[PDB]
Amino acid sequence: QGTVNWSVEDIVKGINSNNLESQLQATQAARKLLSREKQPPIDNIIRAGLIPKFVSFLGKTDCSPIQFESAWALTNIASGTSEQTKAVVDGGAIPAFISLLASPHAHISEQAVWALGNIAGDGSAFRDLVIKHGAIDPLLALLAVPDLSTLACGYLRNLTWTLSNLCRNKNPAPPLDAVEQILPTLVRLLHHNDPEVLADSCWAISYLTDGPNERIEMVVKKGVVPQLVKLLGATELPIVTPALRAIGNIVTGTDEQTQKVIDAGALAVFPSLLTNPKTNIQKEATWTMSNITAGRQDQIQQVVNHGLVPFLVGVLSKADFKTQKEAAWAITNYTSGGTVEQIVYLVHCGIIEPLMNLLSAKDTKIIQVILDAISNIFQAAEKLGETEKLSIMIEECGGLDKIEALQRHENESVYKASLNLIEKYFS
């Protein structure tokens, strides 16, 4: 109760005293200000020039309590805007926090982990600077135990979180060797039984797979895909979300990389994902499906075998517009790479009507996408001499009325494609 709601000037008075105990008390008072529920006075603390004092306090092995209070204070300053985080880094906090990772006091070590997480979390530059200062080794050493279950819950969550921030951000992506250094521990965390650890582990993996094929490969070669697929079926949404994010990222890679996702049994989870009550899950799942239908004919076939086409018809028929649009993409990709048989199967499942209904949308891109798909479907119909059966099917659901109208469209590509369709299959 004695260090509650001090003014900044009193905090300064105590910290500038030559009395370690007075300094400890003032530092704690600063910590409590910075820990309050509402509007922590971060800038006032910075302007008082307190950061260098806090950083020096980090080095006081002789007085662990002031180490902890200043660590906590600096953590909260670093949790703010980029400028506020910069002030902490500018004060030399990075190497000081890294030295603290080795502290015999778990709560102090944990605090340093947290602070480094905030710093790395600011962006690529601070992320890489934290790495250059040598944070990874001591961080990983804290997790070098026979069984993660012996570690304190909060402690393990903080470590996992800070690691995921080290895996986060692009332009540039994290250093290749740093990723390689981290991955094995990350794979181990991905098998832990704590929901929070699992969520953050998945987020890390999703960050690492958000890039070119080579980055995806680094992850896939670690054999995590089956575990990701398992996590994809979890009951917890905060686990399913990053798990699905990662799987989606992986299938943006090569067909061989996509095949690993299929082989691991991912497609069997999609009936649920494509009807998931969470809008974002349906969108992400449909987007993922579109990149799978952009693959090989044998990969399209597995989509067929898993009974996923009716589910695509479903989302095309009714879903959030953004989702419907991913569905349109999935269809064009499907029709562009599929065999004749696969394409006819698509029409038999009822793709045509919900496709036509989306033509009335005021989004220029999806219209192009849908028009292209129709052209693809017609092409398959020509090889069957059933172009007329398609034209009527389109006519009867009011598709012709929409396409005819599209001959008068702002976009050039639109009316040209529609005009073409008219004088080729109608007229």
Partner: peptide, 23 residues
């Protein structure tokens, strides 16, 4: 063909930083 993450979208919306308000 395959479509990667749009450059104008975030990486999932997870908080980048965390303020400690309790012990």
């Amino acid at each position: 063909m395959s479509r990667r993450r749009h450059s104008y979208e975030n990486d999932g919306g997870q908080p980048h930083k965390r303020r400690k308000t309790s012990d």
